[PDB]
Amino acid sequence: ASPFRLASAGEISEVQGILRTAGLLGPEKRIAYLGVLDPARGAGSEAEDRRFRVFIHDVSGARPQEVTVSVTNGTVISAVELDTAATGELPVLEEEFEVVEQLLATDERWLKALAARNLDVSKVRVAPLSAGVFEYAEERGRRILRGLAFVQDFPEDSAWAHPVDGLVAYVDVVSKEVTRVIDTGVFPVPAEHGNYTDPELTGPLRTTQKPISITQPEGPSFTVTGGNHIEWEKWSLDVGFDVREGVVLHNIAFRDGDRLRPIINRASIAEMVVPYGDPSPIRSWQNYFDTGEYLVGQYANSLELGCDCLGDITYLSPVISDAFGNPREIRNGICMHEEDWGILAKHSDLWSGINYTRRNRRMVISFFTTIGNYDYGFYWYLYLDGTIEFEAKATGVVFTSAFPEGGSDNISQLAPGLGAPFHQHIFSARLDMAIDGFTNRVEEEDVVRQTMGPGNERGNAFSRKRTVLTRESEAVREADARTGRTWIISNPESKNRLNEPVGYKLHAHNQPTLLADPGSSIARRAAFATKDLWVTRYADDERYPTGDFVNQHSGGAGLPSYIAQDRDIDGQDIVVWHTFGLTHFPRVEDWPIMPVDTVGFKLRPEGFFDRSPVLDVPAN
Amino acid sequence: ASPFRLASAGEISEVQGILRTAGLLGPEKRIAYLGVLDPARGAGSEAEDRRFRVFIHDVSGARPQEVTVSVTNGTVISAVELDTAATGELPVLEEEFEVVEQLLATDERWLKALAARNLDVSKVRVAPLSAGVFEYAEERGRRILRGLAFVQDFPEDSAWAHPVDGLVAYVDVVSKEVTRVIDTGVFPVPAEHGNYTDPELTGPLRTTQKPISITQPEGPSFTVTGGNHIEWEKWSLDVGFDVREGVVLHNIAFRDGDRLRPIINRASIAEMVVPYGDPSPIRSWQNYFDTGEYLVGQYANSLELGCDCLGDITYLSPVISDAFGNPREIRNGICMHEEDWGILAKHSDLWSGINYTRRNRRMVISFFTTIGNYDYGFYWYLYLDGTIEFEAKATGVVFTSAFPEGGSDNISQLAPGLGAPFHQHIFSARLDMAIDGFTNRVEEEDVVRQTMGPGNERGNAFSRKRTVLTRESEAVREADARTGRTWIISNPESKNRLNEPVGYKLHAHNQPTLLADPGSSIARRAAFATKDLWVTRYADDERYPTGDFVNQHSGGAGLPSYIAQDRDIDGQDIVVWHTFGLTHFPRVEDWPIMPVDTVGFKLRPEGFFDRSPVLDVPAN
Ligand SMILES: [NH3+]CCc1ccccc1
Ligand SMILES: [NH3+]CCc1ccccc1
Ligand SMILES: [Cu+2]
Ligand SMILES: [Cu+2]
Ligand code: NA
Ligand code: NA
Predict the structure, then answer these.
(1) ∠ CA A245-A246-A252 to the nearest 5 degrees?
(2) For chain B, which domains are there?
(3) Is A117 exposed, middle or buried (0-12, 13-18, 19+ CB in 10 A)?
(4) Is there a contact between A213 and B209 if contact means CB atoms under 8 Å apart?
């Protein structure tokens, strides 16, 4: 009965029928995106209307469409023809992955390049890479993918060990034309394999690891009702799933005594981008938006008990649409479980004689996605003490190149002849804030150093200052680790027992933001990634920091367009957008398969409660 | 048989007898510090000599002594009389904790202050606080503690809820004289209790937490031999324990195939300091060095199975000396266990069809100490993938004051009338490095941004630069989060298969360093805390960043004295000193007992191995 419930197979089958009947799902059509729309603000009228948004691609070159349909009312609400030279191309289709390799396999320029390197075309895999927007005027309005080649020695070989450098091709996947084949020189194809299941590479496997058994003999402490509504240790929330964003958290709230107190209305990773820092023409165009161009949710893995998730696991199996509107279950796509988290609070008092120890725990909601060479785990954590944390875990295989004779300032060597270009992995968290309700504001908090002198005679004092961000034009903020800079989201109309506004503090990891030159194409297309923190006024249609159609969009859409409205954000319905990322100079230890590295952020209560909220936790 | 073995009860009893026989342990003597000395460099002659260092205090006002004794040879090696006006006072004795309260309880000025506030002297606890060095010339050469008062309403009451502000006393604990009683005004004693085991405060305890059972049915994967030698998943090390530093890690090494490869010779937290940022004369002198002034190891807790450490736990019970030379066991003072740590590596390959997942785990070595109101857990982690991590967990009760009517720029309000002054918790990790042996060097690594232009026509390139630190005068470094600054410790004479020097990268959290004015007493006494990274040339006697005798030392000893020698550190036996800390603006949620907050650092291999070192981990 909940409007925030997951999409069902039947809902998607109804959408397909509505689209078909309306003439919008002919045999040349493909669904490139399908997702449920969130309820509008002020839907508390209790009139459920399950609406879906659909992007429809046309493989014959007709104009794609954006369609909204109501499954509640069985009708098409709106259907808009898109001009992609203007607003951007639709996301990459899974079925286009193979089309780049097959189109090149009959191109005479491509075959000529492979023949000069003595490569059998049947062994050559071609990565289908998003094109971006660069200097090629013939690409405007065309659906382009670029291809980089890797050799597979045999069908189980790891092709990433064998990049074919000095060669790139551009393909129009609608008209099935190879527009350009660039061959800048022959590089030796690196010879060593990277087959990390080969006993010859792994050596004998360890016999020394003894099992760790994690069990919950009376079951888990959380309940799941209505398919996706979680209650756990005073927390309440709904777990959603979107094919673009992946796991989305709705209605995060905390039961403080009798009141259910809202904290976050909607939390998601709304974009991610991987820019490469290699100036070679073979790769200098390479930047993929896994979220906005490829849709990370449709590549979610089926997670295996005991391998991917350990302990007493509850699964959710979200349903998405395939390219024809058929429902597709992602079996065991979301893992949910609670984890011991060490000591929560501890004190042995010399004067009272009381010895006090309490254990912490956290609720984990996670999913794992794979897009080509890279694999990412997205983890949301809820802690007993009111802390909310996000963690991204990056693993998979690094994207490779040749390592040039005589070295490189922008590539590291992983193996003889084998290089890994420098790159970043940058995420945008979109936090639709609702601290005790919707009237919120953001303050920037800096440590303040004080000089020795009158009133500070021993030179020990220090303080802090808070600056309210009142309008969108002043709410684009940078990190400053040296001044301990954090941001507090408060509700000026909701006070704690000390008559101070209730709040939550955002703690960032303060990693570098986008390194590319501010005049570059990527700095325009990924403008969100150039600053650590943005605050906007909530609006229904301002969903992604990069805009709705990221693929081949020329830049400036999303956040820099939103904030030009200069709306009032001082005690209003606001959205915080936090940029965070990893700068990756690949190491030898990252090869042939990369150990997990992590990045994230956390929010901690800041005078939200009237005292510690974990005084009622028992002693195990 | 290992020279790095823990001190035994019999060794300490032998030391006591040697001291007694030599006339150094008369009835006016107290042992203020006793610890085993590490073997000297070049002890590979196989001639074990177990030597102990002893600080001896004299309660009758005679000069203290520093004594070194050999239990192997039953002799006193050296005995030096100390001039404490010059080199510093000895650490605080546990038996002096009560002396401040008892001396004040008969002082007419003290009684007059309490009577004006209607406080029964029998209910007034006095914290024994280290004095530092300020403007009082009569304190030079005297053993001074300062006292701040708290009211206990009944013997099980939490006195921290009831600070007596506007009152401080200074005491000479050797001559048993109250030197000064300062009363700057009456403040209401805050009335609410902070008794976090009181059902009236906690409410009904939760019934919703179900048990998490962590077991190892075939036992743990690590072995302990020789009392304190650990082998676990290719790691090798010795766990030491020192009454000043706590847990110390020796001879950290990793078995890479057939070679045992050294990584760190000695790792410890060598100092910590808590400076307060309240300019009130009542507290503006307050800075305690829990390590150097109080000795955190002698306050280590006995850790309870299932409460403090959960899972399959192996304990170590270290032995220290009491004030008279008797051995004192700290039962269950060190917890050792392995922990599941999620996904280690994962990839599903679109071209090979191979699906690959491996689990991570970590080895945990931990202890917990309590000094007055504060409690700290020290955690060392070893991971499968070669990562070493330290984490400090701060909890306990915040140090309190009155909250002034009309507010404060340097104190936060926790309850009606009750304040918590701003402060920092700053740690110094001392890492005696041994990356593949003792010829090491440190490079500082910054990200380098590049401008659009020739050779970088699309403005996407970025790079990195490494600066070798060649002499001690240039090896005092600051963090720079914005440039992704890290430090690499390498061995220029040991190369990986790519002919690159092997190394480890130090990743800092980049929290603010010491905030006090550079001209303050604390900035001189805690000079290490003003910079993030120092590198020195190894020397036997350069043990602590603050010097051997921190209590009441006037400043400048330790690191700023060491680095003035300007020694060669480029491919030499070097020591890295990393400052890291938390800046604490107390929140309401920190009261009446504080949920754990954390800080730390990690080291990750950087071309130390020839490929991922976890290819031989099995699939569970
Ligand atoms: N992550 C999106 C880029 C990509 C997609 C498919 C194969 C290799 C790389
Ligand atoms: N942590 C060292 C300071 C201290 C010592 C004893 C009581 C309160 C405070
Ligand atoms: Cu990467
Ligand atoms: Cu603190
Ligand atoms: Na909002
Ligand atoms: Na060294």
Answers:
(1) 90
(2) 1-87 (3.10.450.40), 94-195 (3.10.450.40), 196-619 (2.70.98.20)
(3) middle
(4) no
DSSP B124-164: EEEEEEE----S-GGGTTS-EEEEEEEE-SSTTS-GGGSEE
Write out the two tokens for A441: 């504001």
Q: Do B152 and A352 touch (CB under 8 A)?
A: yes
Ligand closest to B420 (CA) is: 4
Give chain A positions within 8 Å (CB) of B604: 589
Whether A159 and B352 lie within 8 Å, measured CB to CB? yes
Contacts of B587 in chain A (CB under 8 A): 605-607
Tell me, what DSSP letter sits at residue B308? T
SS3 content of chain A, % helix, strand, coil (to 5): 15, 40, 45
CA distance A56 to A65: 5
Does any ligand 1 atom lie closer than 6 A to the CB of residue A294? yes
d(CA B334, CA B315): 6
Tokens, residue A26: 């002919």
Distance CA A342, CA B596 (A): 10
B479, two tokens: 């963090």
DSSP string, A428-484: EEEEEE-TTSS-BEEEEEEEEE--SBTTBTTS--EEEEEEEE-BGGG-EE---GGGT
Is residue B610 classed exposed, middle or buried when 0-12, 13-18 and 19+ CB atoms within 10 A define those classes?
Answer: middle
Resolution for this PDB entry, in angstroms: 1.7
Q: Give, in degrees to the nearest 5, the angle at Cα B12 between B10 and B18.
A: 105
Quote the CA–CA distance of A594 and A400 in Å, as a whole number: 13
Q: How far apart are CA A274 and CA A586, in angstroms?
A: 14
- Cα A540 to Cα A3, A536, B300, B521, distances in angstroms: 16, 12, 56, 56
Write out the two tokens for B353. 């069809």
Structure solved via? X-ray
Nearest-Cα distance to chain B for A474, in Å, is 21
Tell me which of A38, A290, A532, A590 is the catalytic residue. Answer: A290
Q: Rounded to whole angstroms, what are the CA distances from A316 to A52, A253, A303, A334, A367? A: 21, 21, 10, 5, 10
Computed over its alpha carbons, how large is the radius of gyration of chain A? 26
Tell the residue nearest (CA) to atom 1 of ligand 2: B371
**Is the C-alpha dihedral spanning A467, A468, A474, A475 positive or negative?**
positive
Sign for the pseudo-dihedral over CA of A15, A21, A22, A27: positive
Tell me which residues of chain B, numbers 35 to 94, contact chain A at a CB-CB cutoff of 8 Å: none
- How far apart are the CA of B434 and the centre of ligand 6, in A? 5
Q: Give distance in angstroms: CA of A373 to centre of ligand 4.
A: 44
Report d(CA A576, CA A442) in Å as an integer: 9
Q: Is A148 in the pocket of ligand 1 (CB under 6 A)?
A: no
Q: Is A374 a catalytic residue?
A: yes
Tell me how many degrees the CA angle B85-B28-B241 measures, rounded to the nearest 5.
75
Has B356 been labeled as part of a binding site?
no
CB A574 within 8 A of CB A535: yes
Number of residues that make up chain A? 620
The Cα A508–Cα A455 span in angstroms is 33
Query: Is B125 in CB contact (< 8 Å) with chain A?
Result: yes
Rounded to an integer, what distance in angstroms lies between the CA atom of residue B242 and that of residue B319?
A: 9
Query: A525 Cβ partners below 8 Å, 6+ apart?
Result: A132, A133, A287, A546, A550, A553, A554, A555
Establish whether residue A4 lines the binding site of ligand 1, counting it when its CB lies within 6 angstroms of any ligand atom. no
Candidate list A374, A379, A504, A544, residue with the active-site label: A374
Q: Which residue of B has its CA nearest to A354?
A: B156
Has B381 been annotated as catalytic? Answer: no
